[PDB]
């Protein structure tokens with residue numbers, strides 16, 4: 001199972017992680033049953 | 049989940065992912081029934097010494 005937990009927190013701070021407490025509610029459980037050792041993030045490019 | 053008790057309306061704000069509630073003794077304290085998705089409170093039936 002791939003368990004994903006999430007929480008949206010409206011902030012107004014500039015640079016660092018805001019200091020506080022906020023529990024993360026689960027979104028979905030994914031019956032992948034696969035091997036995972038690495039991960040990579042997906043971004044978007046801006047073209048003018 | 050098998051058990052015995054009185055099923056009443058509950059005012060406990062279950063979050064959407066939450067299914068059932070548990071007490072200290074690990075017995076079920078509340079339940080979300082299928083086909084209605086509404087939150088039911090479970091209270092044990094009356095008992096005591098005679």
Ligand SMILES: *[C@@H]1O[C@H](CO)[C@@H](O)[C@H](O)[C@H]1NC(C)=O
Pocket residue numbers: 082083084
């Ligand atoms: C059947 O159960 C689903 C939950 O799995 C619920 O969303 C749906 O409303 C139920 N349908 C009826 C007719 O009770």
